[PDB]
Scaffold this active site. Structure first.
Site, PDB file in Angstrom:
ATOM      1  N   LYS A 161       0.800  -1.216   0.000  1.00 18.75           N
ATOM      2  CA  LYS A 161       0.000   0.000   0.000  1.00 18.75           C
ATOM      3  C   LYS A 161       0.838   1.272   0.000  1.00 18.75           C
ATOM      4  O   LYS A 161       1.903   1.328   0.610  1.00 18.75           O
ATOM      5  CB  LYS A 161      -0.937   0.000   1.210  1.00 18.75           C
ATOM      6  CG  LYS A 161      -1.921  -1.164   1.224  1.00 18.75           C
ATOM      7  CD  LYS A 161      -2.779  -1.164   2.475  1.00 18.75           C
ATOM      8  CE  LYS A 161      -1.945  -1.381   3.723  1.00 18.75           C
ATOM      9  NZ  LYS A 161      -2.792  -1.345   4.945  1.00 18.75           N
ATOM     10  N   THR A 188      -9.344   8.293  10.338  1.00 16.94           N
ATOM     11  CA  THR A 188      -8.481   7.361   9.629  1.00 16.94           C
ATOM     12  C   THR A 188      -8.185   6.107  10.444  1.00 16.94           C
ATOM     13  O   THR A 188      -7.484   5.206   9.978  1.00 16.94           O
ATOM     14  CB  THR A 188      -7.145   8.030   9.265  1.00 16.94           C
ATOM     15  OG1 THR A 188      -6.499   8.487  10.461  1.00 16.94           O
ATOM     16  CG2 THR A 188      -7.383   9.217   8.340  1.00 16.94           C
ATOM     17  N   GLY A 231      -8.360   2.589  11.740  1.00 11.52           N
ATOM     18  CA  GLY A 231      -8.897   1.355  11.190  1.00 11.52           C
ATOM     19  C   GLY A 231      -8.929   1.250   9.672  1.00 11.52           C
ATOM     20  O   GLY A 231      -9.624   0.393   9.125  1.00 11.52           O
ATOM     21  N   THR A 232      -8.182   2.110   8.989  1.00 13.75           N
ATOM     22  CA  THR A 232      -8.133   2.090   7.530  1.00 13.75           C
ATOM     23  C   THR A 232      -7.569   0.771   6.988  1.00 13.75           C
ATOM     24  O   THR A 232      -8.218   0.090   6.192  1.00 13.75           O
ATOM     25  CB  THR A 232      -7.272   3.257   6.993  1.00 13.75           C
ATOM     26  OG1 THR A 232      -7.989   4.487   7.157  1.00 13.75           O
ATOM     27  CG2 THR A 232      -6.941   3.053   5.518  1.00 13.75           C
ATOM     28  N   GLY A 233      -6.358   0.422   7.417  1.00 12.30           N
ATOM     29  CA  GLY A 233      -5.734  -0.808   6.957  1.00 12.30           C
ATOM     30  C   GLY A 233      -6.522  -2.041   7.360  1.00 12.30           C
ATOM     31  O   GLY A 233      -6.644  -2.998   6.592  1.00 12.30           O
ATOM     32  N   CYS A 234      -7.049  -2.023   8.578  1.00 11.53           N
ATOM     33  CA  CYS A 234      -7.843  -3.128   9.095  1.00 11.53           C
ATOM     34  C   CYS A 234      -9.102  -3.342   8.297  1.00 11.53           C
ATOM     35  O   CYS A 234      -9.458  -4.470   7.965  1.00 11.53           O
ATOM     36  CB  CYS A 234      -8.218  -2.838  10.531  1.00 11.53           C
ATOM     37  SG  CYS A 234      -9.279  -4.034  11.337  1.00 11.53           S
TER      38      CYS A 234
END
Lengths: 246, 246
Positions: free
Chosen positions: A164, A193, A195-198
């Site tokens: 990413k 923002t 918890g974006t990757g999660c």
């Protein structure tokens, strides 16, 4: 009905961890199961306290779920420490948990166990540029350099790699033995923002569980994330959660 | 957007515990937060392993959530032991967590702490006939005897009592200082009964969070449960989960 498993940490604030994963599974019409690795007292300001679970307790949860429910997909999140990573890898191997989405969510030792024991079992790894640099050690600052990075991580055993923010609008690279693909997403700015990757790795797992091919799962997951970010609610005093209802 | 908190245990199988509570909050358009009390390796056959969390870790989660998010309602589920019940009661009092739905989900000592420390802080307690008998000690086998039971529990401090299955189609009694009400629900038979009580208390908490009056929250929660039971999915080999998408 399809079933998905998340092997990750608990976020009391509900914005990330298994809380976010299960909300995403539910939003996507997928039945959610979870094996907790650790428990955190957490809010939009950060983590206030961490309690790691015994490795055998994490293993037991995976076993209980895997033998009773059919698992059409799964993801890993925060793993706490090397001992837990190892128990998770053993469980994933023993119970044939696949396809597996390993979301780095990065101890020196834990990173080693992750790369050596878990990456070989992954159908996809979703590290961000930073994490990518940490795992490889090498620095990343250009698209070409990012693509090499993606391919480099691929050599660690995973069947696919989603690096990413490989190049900054914001482009992510999906590398497989066949080649490298590039995804472009609107660099939407907002305070929410957390918890974006999660949320992204959970959506990918959910889509894979419903039968979507990898590349398409990633594109649809990213489209979902963008919507989730755009209408994020004003909750919390720090970095608020995403709008998982999006 | 309204927010609700669940203080309960983790069910890896996803049919009850915080997993079910959060799915219900999400279904009802309520943002979910959670303070885990314990972690279980569990499936549709039952509980395979239990890991209780340190009382201070449970307290810390409630504190982290309560000071960052506005809590429009909350519920308690499995509390593990007396030490945890006490920490939960202290936290609930200290942070003014209300309205609170205490779902018994029943150690001799833990029951004592529950009744003495937590019941006085409850806006509603949702014990089933069995649990009711256990808490009071007295036996329940008739409607009139059930109503006395409800009123008896009311004297323990809670502002309202929902004694489920007070009389067997299946009638539940809602007792308040003002009087006793009777709710009737279709005694729908099915194997997917795992998480029935949990799903009910979670729906009530969610409805209270959205501003529904108690009596109406209970009626709408029961209507939801009935739908959830009717289209329960065929998942698991034992008693499957409810259809929370209903």
């Amino acid at each position: 009905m399809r079933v998905a498993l998340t092997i990750a940490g608990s976020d009391s604030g509900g914005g990330a961890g298994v809380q976010a994963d299960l909300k995403v599974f539910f939003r996507f019409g997928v039945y959610g199961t979870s094996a907790l690795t650790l428990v955190t007292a957490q809010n939009t300001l950060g983590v206030q306290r961490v309690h790691l679970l015994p490795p055998e307790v994490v293993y037991a949860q995976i076993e209980s779920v895997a033998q009773d429910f059919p698992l059409h997909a799964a993801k890993t999140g925060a793993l706490g420490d090397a001992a837990i990573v190892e128990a998770v890898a053993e469980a994933v191997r023993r119970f044939g948990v696949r396809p597996l989405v390993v979301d780095p969510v990065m101890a020196k030792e834990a990173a080693a166990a992750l790369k050596e024991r878990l990456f070989p079992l992954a159908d996809l790894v979703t590290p961000n540029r930073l994490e990518a640099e940490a795992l490889l050690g090498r620095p990343i600052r250009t698209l070409k350099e990012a693509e090499e990075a993606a391919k480099a991580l691929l050599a660690l055993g995973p069947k696919a790699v989603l690096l990413k923010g490989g190049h900054l609008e914001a482009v992510d690279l999906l590398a497989t033995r066949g080649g490298v693909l590039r995804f472009s997403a609107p660099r939407v700015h907002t305070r929410n923002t957390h918890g974006t990757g999660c949320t992204l790795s959970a959506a990918i797992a959910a889509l894979l569980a419903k039968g979507r091919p990898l590349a398409e799962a990633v594109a649809e997951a990213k489209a979902y994330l963008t919507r989730a970010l755009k209408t994020a609610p004003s909750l919390g005093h720090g970095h608020g959660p995403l709008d998982h209802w999006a």
